[PDB]
């Protein structure tokens, strides 16, 4: 999370871009369920996290998508 947020700022400078913008979304069932999908935009590419029930989870998946794409 912390480091997730940061390595991506490092990578945003190591590449010349304008800082990662985080977004959040929701899907809410008629009966009980709330699942947040989170997003990270760096470069001009939005990277999308898995759907989960808790924002930390998805905040991180979203980042794990961002770093792992970057790596390759």
Swiss-Prot record:
KO phenotype (gene knockout): Short plant, delayed flowering, leaf hyponasty, reduced fertility, decreased rate of root growth, altered root gravitropic response, decreased sensitivity to auxin and cytokinin and hypersensitivity to abscisic acid (ABA). Reduction of several miRNA accumulation.
Tissue expression per record: Expressed in rosette and cauline leaves, stems, roots, flowers and siliques.
Induction: By abscisic acid (ABA).
Domain DRBM intervals: 3-72
Cellular compartment(s): Nucleus; Nucleus speckle
Function: Double-stranded RNA-binding protein involved in RNA-mediated post-transcriptional gene silencing (PTGS). Functions in the microRNAs (miRNAs) biogenesis by assisting DICER-LIKE 1 (DCL1) in the accurate processing from primary miRNAs (pri-miRNAs) to miRNAs in the nucleus. Forms a complex with SERRATE (SE) and DCL1 to promote accurate processing of pri-miRNAs by DCL1. Binds and assist DCL1 for accurate processing of precursor miRNAs (pre-miRNA).
Other remarks in the entry: Plants overexpressing HYL1 show decreased stability of transcripts targeted by miRNAs.
Binding partners and assembly: Homodimer. Heterodimer with DRB2, DRB4 or DRB5. Interacts with SE and DCL1. Interacts with RCF3, RS40 and RS41.
Domain-level remarks: The dsRNA binding domains (dsRBDs) 1 and 2 are sufficient for the function in miRNA precursors processing and mature miRNA generation.
Name used for this protein in its record: Double-stranded RNA-binding protein 1
Biological classification of the source: Eukaryota, Viridiplantae, Streptophyta, Embryophyta, Tracheophyta
Gene responsible for this protein: DRB1
